Design a protein around this motif. Structure first.
Motif, PDB file in Angstrom:
ATOM      1  N   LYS D  16       0.735  -1.290  -0.142  1.00 31.57           N
ATOM      2  CA  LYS D  16      -0.029   0.188  -0.071  1.00 31.57           C
ATOM      3  C   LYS D  16       0.914   1.054  -0.041  1.00 31.57           C
ATOM      4  O   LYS D  16       2.032   1.233   0.498  1.00 31.57           O
ATOM      5  N   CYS D  17       0.212   2.171  -0.658  1.00 24.89           N
ATOM      6  CA  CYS D  17       1.081   3.685  -0.655  1.00 24.89           C
ATOM      7  C   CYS D  17       0.968   4.239   0.671  1.00 24.89           C
ATOM      8  O   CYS D  17       0.224   4.125   1.508  1.00 24.89           O
ATOM      9  N   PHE D  18       2.022   4.932   1.000  1.00 27.19           N
ATOM     10  CA  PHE D  18       2.345   5.504   2.466  1.00 27.19           C
ATOM     11  C   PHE D  18       1.584   6.774   2.452  1.00 27.19           C
ATOM     12  O   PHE D  18       1.130   6.950   3.576  1.00 27.19           O
ATOM     13  N   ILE D  19       1.268   7.562   1.411  1.00 23.86           N
ATOM     14  CA  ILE D  19       0.414   8.959   1.458  1.00 23.86           C
ATOM     15  C   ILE D  19      -1.059   8.493   1.346  1.00 23.86           C
ATOM     16  O   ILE D  19      -1.783   8.718   2.344  1.00 23.86           O
ATOM     17  N   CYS D  20      -1.401   7.994   0.202  1.00 23.16           N
ATOM     18  CA  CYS D  20      -2.984   7.810  -0.070  1.00 23.16           C
ATOM     19  C   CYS D  20      -3.210   6.384   0.829  1.00 23.16           C
ATOM     20  O   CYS D  20      -4.428   6.534   1.071  1.00 23.16           O
ATOM     21  N   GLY D  21      -2.700   5.479   1.121  1.00 23.93           N
ATOM     22  CA  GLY D  21      -3.085   4.367   1.611  1.00 23.93           C
ATOM     23  C   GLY D  21      -3.715   3.351   0.577  1.00 23.93           C
ATOM     24  O   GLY D  21      -4.307   2.238   0.978  1.00 23.93           O
ATOM     25  N   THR D  36       5.186   3.450 -10.424  1.00 27.47           N
ATOM     26  CA  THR D  36       5.094   4.544 -10.851  1.00 27.47           C
ATOM     27  C   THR D  36       4.184   5.783  -9.873  1.00 27.47           C
ATOM     28  O   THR D  36       4.571   6.889  -9.704  1.00 27.47           O
ATOM     29  N   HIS D  37       3.138   5.224  -9.351  1.00 25.33           N
ATOM     30  CA  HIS D  37       2.456   6.186  -8.311  1.00 25.33           C
ATOM     31  C   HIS D  37       3.442   6.498  -7.096  1.00 25.33           C
ATOM     32  O   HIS D  37       3.452   7.592  -6.724  1.00 25.33           O
ATOM     33  N   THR D  38       3.934   5.572  -6.497  1.00 21.93           N
ATOM     34  CA  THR D  38       4.601   5.635  -5.224  1.00 21.93           C
ATOM     35  C   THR D  38       6.184   6.392  -5.538  1.00 21.93           C
ATOM     36  O   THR D  38       6.849   6.430  -4.492  1.00 21.93           O
ATOM     37  N   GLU D  41       4.013  10.220  -8.354  1.00 20.05           N
ATOM     38  CA  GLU D  41       2.886  10.761  -7.932  1.00 20.05           C
ATOM     39  C   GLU D  41       2.904  11.256  -6.376  1.00 20.05           C
ATOM     40  O   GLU D  41       2.417  12.279  -5.935  1.00 20.05           O
ATOM     41  N   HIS D  42       3.279   9.973  -5.434  1.00 18.99           N
ATOM     42  CA  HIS D  42       2.946  10.118  -4.083  1.00 18.99           C
ATOM     43  C   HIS D  42       4.382   9.817  -3.435  1.00 18.99           C
ATOM     44  O   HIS D  42       4.241   8.795  -2.491  1.00 18.99           O
ATOM     45  N   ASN D  43       5.241  10.357  -3.993  1.00 22.11           N
ATOM     46  CA  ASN D  43       6.690   9.899  -3.270  1.00 22.11           C
ATOM     47  C   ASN D  43       6.835  10.929  -2.008  1.00 22.11           C
ATOM     48  O   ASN D  43       6.684  12.026  -2.113  1.00 22.11           O
TER      49      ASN D  43
HETATM   50 ZN   LIG Z   1      -0.383   7.352  -2.951  1.00 21.68          ZN
END
Ligand SMILES: [Zn+2]
Ligand SMILES: Nc1ncnc2c1ncn2[C@@H]1O[C@H](COP(=O)(O)OP(=O)(O)OP(=O)(O)O)[C@@H](O)[C@H]1O
Ligand SMILES: Nc1ncnc2c1ncn2[C@@H]1O[C@H](COP(=O)(O)OP(=O)(O)OP(=O)(O)O)[C@@H](O)[C@H]1O
Ligand SMILES: [Zn+2]
Lengths: 458, 184, 145, 96
Positions: D16-21, D36-38, D41-43
Motif C-alpha cells: 500500500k502507498c504511504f500517503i494515500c493508502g 509509478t504512483h509511489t 505521484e505520491h513520493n
Molecule cells: Zn499514494
C-alpha cells in the motif's frame, strides 16, 4: 585421421560430462569406505609405527586399491566438471561481458574500478576473434560498433573490439581466392586462439567449484602419503546430500550474527578477566599442593585464556572452577561476579546462539511458505490473482499451465533463438527485436487474453 | 514545468506529444530538479503540484545517514503508529530531516595491489602452461602419433587435464606467496 | 506375542507401556514434534558422528599423549592409541560431557601444543556441545511451530 | 518478534502507498502502476522536498496552491494530504 581423433576425443568428453555426477557420488562412497577401514588403524611401537590392524589381513590391499581408485575418480570428476559445468560458466561470463559492453559501455564510456578482478580479467576476451564462443549473440561487436563508433571513434572502437575493418572491406571487394587445408598440423596449431584460451583458463581458475574439486584431488593425492588425509573428503557430504544443506543452512543463515555473538562473548569475558585481575587475583590458585602455587591470573593473558577456556565451558561459570569465597572481605563482590558471569555468559549468550539457530529454521520455513503461497495465489507472468481466473472452474490452473506457462515462455525463447532471423514472422520479429534491445514490455503485465476479451469470450 | 503540466493534464494530445519530442532535451535536463506531488486542493479536488528540487537537497537526501533515519522513521510509524497521527509524525520527520540536511549542507566545504598480484600470477602461470604450444614443441607429440594407439589417445587426453591441474596448483602457490609478501 | 512372553518372563510386560502413545492422542501431538523432523534429527546425529570422527582423527594424529585415563602410574590406560578406541571414547564421553572432550582429557598447560589443544577443545565445545545440540533444539521447536 | 516486525514493515510498504493508502493492485491494473504512483505521484521524498521548498520560499512569492498548503501547514491541518484518493482515481474515466 584428424576427423576421427577429434571424434573419439569428443566421445570421451561426452562420457565424462554425462557421468560427472555418478563419479561424484562414487568418490564419496570410496571416501566413506576408506574412512571406515581407517577405524581399524592402530599405533604400534622409539618411532611410533602406525599399523593397520585386522584379523583378515586383506584390508591393506583393499586400502591401497581404494586410495588409488579414489585418486582416479577425483581426476575424472575434475575432467567431468571441465566437460560439463565450465561451458555454462564461460557462457554466463561471456553474456555478462557482452551486455556490459553494449548497454553499459564498460570499456568505452567508463572503465572498471580496478577493484573488480572479474572486470580487469574480462578486458582480454574483448580483442579475441573467438568472442561469443559460447554466447549465441555473435553480433555483439557489430552492435557496439554501431552504438559507439560514430561518437567515441570508429578506429579506436575497432581496435578495442579487435575488428579488422580494412581487411573486411578488401574481402567484400575484389579479392583473390585462397584454399584452406585443415589437414596441415601447423594450421591446426595456429587455428586456436591463444588469448581467448588464456581468458578462459583464468575464469576457470577463478571459479569456486573448480577450486574445490582441485582441493579434493590434492587431498586425495596427499592421502597416499598419509592415509588420514582421506578424512577431509568426508566434508564433501554437505554438498553431496542436499538434505544436509537445509540442516546446515540454520547455522549459515545467521553465520555473521553467530560470529558477532562469539566476539561479544570474548569482549564480555575480557571485561570479567580485567575485573578479576584487578580485584580477585588471590582466588585463582589452581595448584592443590601448598609447595608450588599455580596462579592462573597473575598475568593478563593467562587470566584471559583461563577464563575463555575453562569458565565458559564450565556449567556454572568461572565460580565453579575458582576458589571458594567464604570468609573474605570481598565475598559479596565475588558472589555478584560469579552470578553475573553465569547469567550473562552461560545463560544469555548461549541463549542468543540458540535463538539465532532456531530463528534461522523459522525464517527458512517462512520463506518456503511465502514462495508456495505466492505461486499458488498469483500468476508468475501477469501477476493477476487466482480468484479472477477461478471465477471459471479451474481457471487459474488453466491460465498458469496453458496461457501463461513460464515453461512455454522459455520454450518460445529457445524456438526464437534457434529459428533463422529471415524466417521470423511478424510477431516473432517483434519479440526478437524487443529481446535484442532488452525491452520486456511484450510480457503481459496486469492483462491477459481473458481480461482483454472478457465480454466477447463470455 | 509548463510542458509537464500540459502533458500530464492532456495525456492524449498528439500535437502536445510532438512538442514533448521537440522539448525532450530540456525535459531530460530538468527531470532531476522537477518535483511532483498531489494535494487535495481548495476545490475539493486532487490537484498535482510542480515545484523545484535543488541539487543540494537531493544530495543531502541521498546521504546514507538520512536514508537510515528514513528507514527508522518508516519502521516506527508502521509498527507503533496510528493512522490519526501518521501525517503528523511524517511532518515532524520531514521538519527534522530538513533541518539536518540544511545543517549538513552548510557544514559542507568546497585491495588494488592484491588484485594486481593475483592478475600477475594468473598471467604468468597461464603463460607457462601455454609456452609448450608457443614453442612449437608438437614434433614430439607428432612422433608419438605416427601410429595410432587408443592408449596413446587416452594418455594424451589425461595428460592435458593433468597439466591444467598442475598449472592451477602453481597459480594457488603463487597467490599464497604473493599474499604473504604483501602482508609482510 | 509380548503378552504371551510375559508369562515366561514378567518383565516382557513392560513393552506394553509403549502402547500409551497410540492409546492417548494427547501424546500424539507431543511425539509429533520429534517425528515431524525425524529424518533431520537422524541426519544431525550422523553429522555429529562425522564431526566427532574428524576430531578423533586430529587427536589420534597429534594429541595421543593426553589421553591417559589411568590415575596410577604403574599401568597407563591409553584411550587413543587405537582409532576405534579413540572414536568410542570421544562419542561416549566427550559428547555427554558438559564442556566437551577437554573436560575429560588431561590438562594442556606447559606443552608445545598448548594453544593447538586449547583451540581443539574450544572448537569441540562450540561445534558439538553448543551448535549441534542447538540444531536438535531448533528442529523440535520448529516442528512444534 | 523483531523479524516479524521487519517483515510487516516490508509488506505494508510493498502493498500500500504511504500517503494515500490505496492498495497496490488498483495501480497495478496499469503495468508498473504502483511503482509509478509511489515514485512519481505520491513520493514521500517529493513531499519532504515540497515542504523544504515552501519553507525556504518567500511568503509573498507563494502561488495559490503554495499559499493554501502554507496556511494549512501553519494551522497544522493535514487535509491537503490525499487520503484514499489520487489523480488517477479522480480522473479515472477521463484519463482512460
Ligand atoms: Zn499514494
Ligand atoms: N506462470 C506460471 N507457470 C507455471 N506455474 C505457475 C505460473 N504462475 C503460477 N503457477 C503455479 O505454480 C504451480 C506449479 O509449480 P511448478 O511448475 O514450479 O512446480 P511444482 O508444481 O512444485 O512441481 P514440479 O517440479 O513437478 O513441476 C501451480 O500451482 C501453478 O498454478
Ligand atoms: N509514498 C511512498 N514513497 C516512496 N515509496 C513508497 C511509497 N509508498 C510505498 N512505497 C514503496 O516503498 C518502497 C521504497 O522503499 P524506500 O524508498 O523506503 O527504500 P528502499 O527501497 O528500501 O531503499 P533505499 O534506502 O535505497 O531508498 C517501494 O517498494 C515503493 O513502492
Ligand atoms: Zn498470467
Amino acid at each position: 585421421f584428424w576427423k576421427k581423433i577429434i571424434a573419439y576425443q569428443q566421445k570421451l568428453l561426452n562420457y565424462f560430462a554425462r557421468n560427472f555426477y555418478n563419479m561424484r557420488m562414487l568418490a564419496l562412497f570410496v571416501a566413506f569406505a576408506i574412512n571406515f577401514i581407517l577405524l581399524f588403524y592402530k599405533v604400534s611401537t622409539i618411532a611410533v609405527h602406525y599399523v593397520l590392524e585386522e584379523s583378515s589381513g586383506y584390508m591393506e590391499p583393499t586400502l591401497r586399491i581404494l586410495a588409488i581408485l579414489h585418486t582416479v575418480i577425483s581426476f575424472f570428476c575434475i575432467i567431468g566438471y571441465y566437460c560439463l559445468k565450465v561451458p555454462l560458466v564461460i557462457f554466463k561470463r561471456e553474456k555478462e561481458v557482452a551486455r556490459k559492453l553494449e548497454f553499459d559501455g564498460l570499456y568505452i564510456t567508463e572503465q572498471p574500478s580496478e577493484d573488480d578482478i572479474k572486470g580487469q580479467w574480462d578486458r582480454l576476451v574483448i580483442n579475441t576473434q573467438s568472442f561469443p564462443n559460447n554466447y549465441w549473440d555473435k553480433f555483439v561487436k557489430r552492435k557496439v560498433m554501431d552504438k559507439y563508433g560514430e561518437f567515441y571513434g570508429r578506429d579506436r572502437i575497432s581496435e578495442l573490439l579487435g575488428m579488422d575493418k580494412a581487411a573486411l572491406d578488401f574481402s567484400d571487394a575484389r579479392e583473390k581466392k585462397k584454399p584452406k587445408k585443415d589437414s596441415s598440423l601447423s594450421a591446426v596449431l595456429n587455428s586456436i586462439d591463444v588469448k581467448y584460451q588464456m581468458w578462459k583458463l583464468g575464469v576457470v581458475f577463478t571459479d569456486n567449484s573448480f577450486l574445490y574439486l582441485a582441493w579434493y584431488m590434492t587431498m586425495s593425492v596427499l592421502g597416499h602419503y598419509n592415509n588420514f588425509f582421506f578424512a577431509a573428503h568426508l566434508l564433501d557430504i554437505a554438498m553431496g546430500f542436499k538434505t544436509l544443506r537445509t540442516i546446515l543452512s540454520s547455522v549459515t543463515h545467521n553465520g555473521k550474527q553467530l560470529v558477532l555473538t562469539v566476539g561479544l562473548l570474548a569482549v564480555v569475558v575480557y571485561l570479567y578477566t580485567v575485573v578479576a585481575f584487578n580485584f580477585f587475583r588471590k582466588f585463582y590458585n589452581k595448584s592443590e599442593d601448598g609447595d608450588t602455587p599455580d596462579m592462573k591470573c597473575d598475568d593478563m593473558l593467562t587470566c584471559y585464556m583461563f577464563h575463555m577456556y575453562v569458565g565458559v565451558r564450565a556449567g556454572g561459570g568461572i565460580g565453579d572452577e575458582i576458589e571458594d569465597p567464604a570468609g573474605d572481605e570481598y565475598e559479596i563482590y565475588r558472589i555478584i561476579f560469579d552470578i553475573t558471569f553465569f547469567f550473562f555468559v552461560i545463560v544469555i549468550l548461549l541463549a542468543i546462539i540458540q535463538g539465532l539457530i532456531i530463528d534461522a529454521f523459522g525464517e527458512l520455513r517462512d520463506q518456503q511458505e511465502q514462495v508456495k503461497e505466492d505461486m499458488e495465489t498469483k500468476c508468475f507472468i501477469c501477476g493477476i490473482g487466482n480468484d479472477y481466473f477461478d471465477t471459471v472452474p479451474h481457471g487459474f490452473e488453466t491460465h498458469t499451465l496453458q496461457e501463461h506457462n513460464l515453461a512455454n515462455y522459455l520454450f518460445f525463447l529457445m524456438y526464437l533463438i534457434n529459428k533463422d532471423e529471415t524466417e521470423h514472422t511478424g510477431q516473432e520479429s517483434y519479440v526478437w527485436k524487443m529481446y535484442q534491445e532488452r525491452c520486456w514490455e511484450f510480457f503481459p503485465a496486469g492483462d491477459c487474453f481473458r481480461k482483454q476479451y472478457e465480454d466477447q469470450l463470455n | 514545468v509548463l510542458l509537464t503540466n500540459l502533458s500530464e493534464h492532456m495525456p492524449n494530445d498528439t500535437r502536445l506529444q510532438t512538442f514533448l519530442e521537440l522539448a525532450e532535451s530540456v525535459l531530460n535536463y530538468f527531470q532531476p530538479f522537477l518535483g511532483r506531488i498531489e494535494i487535495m486542493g481548495s476545490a475539493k479536488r486532487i490537484e498535482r503540484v510542480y515545484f523545484e528540487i535543488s541539487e543540494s537537497s537531493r544530495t543531502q537526501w541521498e546521504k546514507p545517514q538520512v536514508k537510515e533515519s528514513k528507514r527508522q522513521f518508516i519502521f516506527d510509524v508502521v509498527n507503533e503508529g496510528g493512522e490519526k497521527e501518521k501525517m503528523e509524525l511524517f511532518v515532524n520527520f520531514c521538519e527534522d530531516t530538513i533541518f539536518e540536511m540544511q545543517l549538513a549542507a552548510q557544514i559542507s566545504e568546497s585491495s588494488i595491489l592484491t588484485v594486481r598480484s593475483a592478475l600477475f600470477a594468473l598471467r604468468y602461470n597461464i603463460l607457462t602452461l601455454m609456452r609448450m604450444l608457443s614453442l612449437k614443441s608438437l614434433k614430439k607429440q607428432m612422433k608419438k602419433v605416427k601410429k595410432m594407439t587408443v592408449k596413446d589417445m587416452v594418455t594424451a587426453f589425461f595428460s592435458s587435464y593433468w597439466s591444467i591441474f598442475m598449472t592451477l596448483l602453481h597459480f594457488v602457490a603463487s597467490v599464497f606467496r604473493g599474499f604473504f609478501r604483501i602482508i609482510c
